[PDB]
Design a protein around this ligand. Structure first.
Ligand code: MET
Length: 517
């Protein structure tokens, strides 16, 4: 099934300013998008803002601004942040958008016509900050912003309150068996695996029905009205989850503005999402509620949900650190340092160790050696002579790398993809040290041709596979190597030997990554 590769980030609450969590989630989305573009596929990458609900309106109230003005301002800060971070996101969605509201109303009506929405009651605990319903087993005692005694969430530590309201209810309990069949039939649908096991255990225990509306006064009228009942508003999470459906149905112009909402999602070939990137804090919403809504509506389910170790909802300003250390270097560090965990060192010391050790010493040094005037005297890609067994061992690593890295990118597991590329870079470095091509200029010119060609080609292939991670630096590297534009993307260029001998190197000026103290 040839379709548009559809990758999403969460849509972020606009109660507060952009921070590292939001930047991190969207970075992962961006990298996955970029890898699939390098591979030659059509890609639609989506990010955005979640603008309705009690928590947004109360934040606007604290600042003494209208919710309309507040959300527009904070949305602008997110947009500016993602422009500065140099992502390649295809559309930035806002839940205040009138086309999004239309889609929410269509979906609501469909669910109602199916008999899956009924009028009932929610009597229980609720976290306003997480916009989440909680059972009594998910609460404990704690303190609020002042220090007085109250109940808090076990998940997040935020304050919980008791709600008693007549509400529209989604019959989530009826979808337990179908959800379990989906999990078992598609064992790669939630990543990483231990988070998949958590979701399955939760659904095995039983599912209550889910309140999908609230009384309008409780949301300070800052929400989408229920179709046919203006006393009620749509639950911010059904509103929010639906952004993925809306985004899949928007025609977007060259400047990034939506120009049209299509009726049928199949027209644009995006839905369902190939990858939903999320933080671990919103797993239940994406792995239980969302597929239940889609099953109810008769819509296709997403292929993968990837849940990272960080939270979504001692300063670490990403734009400040990127100005200090470099944008590509920061992106590299964030993706290299952690897999699916919080355990990981984000200090200036470790940042410098990885910058110096991996980017400067391993990658950078290797790029300078194979392009240097001392070693590469003709300033071109030489034609290789016969290969030794040691040459063939390195060639085999380079040939195997695209297959290996591709599998890791598709999990997706970006940390392992990076590690696999750097294992090959270390092997190329060891080979260059062994062969000592600086001595071979005088002693054995024929042998240097072979050594230099293999080095150039190893640097090209590794750089291609790192281009989703280091998009700006990869362009500089390809320019130094003199790699034509046509050879900078497409699965055809993952093969060893794609750049012919005779190709002239690009002109010299000059540091790729400068080391720090
Ligand atoms: C449909 S993704 C919603 C994410 C949510 N607004 C959050 O910030 O956690």
């Amino acid at each position: 099934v040839e379709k548009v590769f559809f990758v999403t980030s969460p849509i972020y609450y606009v109660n507060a300013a952009p921070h590292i969590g939001h930047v991190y989630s969207t970075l992962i989305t961006d990298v996955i998008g970029r890898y699939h573009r390098v591979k030659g596929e059509r890609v639609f990458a989506l990010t955005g803002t979640d603008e309705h609900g009690q928590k947004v309106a109360e934040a606007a109230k604290q600042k003494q601004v209208s919710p309309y003005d507040f959300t527009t301002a904070v949305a602008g800060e997110f947009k500016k942040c993602f422009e500065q971070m140099d992502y390649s996101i295809d559309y930035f969605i806002r839940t205040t958008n009138e086309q999004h509201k239309a889609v929410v109303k269509e979906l609501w009506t469909k669910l109602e016509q199916k008999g899956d929405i009924y009028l009932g009651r929610y009597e229980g605990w609720y976290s306003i900050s997480d916009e989440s319903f909680l059972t009594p087993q998910n609460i404990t005692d704690g303190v609020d912003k002042d220090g007085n005694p109250c109940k808090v969430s076990l998940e997040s530590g935020h304050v919980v309150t008791w709600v008693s309201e007549e509400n529209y209810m989604f019959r989530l309990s009826a979808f337990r068996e179908r959800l379990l069949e989906w999990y078992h039939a598609n064992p790669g649908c939630i990543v990483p695996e231990f988070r998949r096991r958590e979701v399955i255990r939760a659904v095995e225990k039983g599912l209550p029905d889910l309140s999908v509306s609230r009384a309008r006064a409780t949301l300070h009228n800052w929400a989408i009205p229920v179709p046919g009942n203006p006393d009620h508003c749509v639950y911010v999470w059904l509103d929010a989850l639906t952004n993925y459906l809306t985004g899949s149905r928007l025609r977007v112009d060259e400047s990034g503005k939506e120009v049209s909402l299509v009726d049928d999602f199949n027209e644009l070939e995006r839905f369902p999402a190939d990858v939903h990137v999320i933080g671990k804090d919103i797993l239940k919403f994406h792995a239980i509620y969302w597929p239940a809504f889609l099953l109810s509506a008769g819509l296709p389910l997403p292929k993968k949900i990837v849940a990272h170790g960080w939270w979504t909802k001692n300063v670490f300003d990403p734009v400040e650190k990127a100005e200090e250390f470099g944008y590509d270097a920061l992106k590299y560090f964030l993706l290299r340092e952690s897999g699916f965990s919080d355990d990981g060192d984000y200090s200036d010391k470790n940042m410098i160790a990885r910058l110096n050790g991996e980017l400067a010493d391993t990658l950078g040094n290797l790029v300078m050696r194979c392009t240097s005037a001392k070693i590469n005297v003709n300033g071109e890609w030489p034609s290789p002579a016969a290969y030794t067994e040691e040459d063939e061992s390195l060639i085999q690593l380079i040939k195997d790398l695209p297959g290996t890295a591709d599998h890791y990118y598709l999990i997706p597991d970006i940390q392992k993809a990076i590690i696999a590329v750097f294992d090959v870079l270390r092997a190329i470095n060891a080979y260059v040290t062994d062969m000592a091509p600086w001595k071979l200029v005088k002693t054995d010119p024929e042998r240097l041709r072979t050594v230099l060609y293999i080095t150039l080609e190893g640097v090209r292939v590794t750089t291609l596979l790192l281009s989703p991670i280091l998009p700006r630096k990869s362009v500089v590297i390809f320019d130094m190597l003199g790699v034509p534009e046509v050879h900078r993307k497409g699965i055809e260029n993952f093969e060893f030997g794609a750049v012919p001998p005779g190709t002239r190197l690009g002109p010299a000026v000059e540091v790729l990554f400068s080391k720090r103290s």
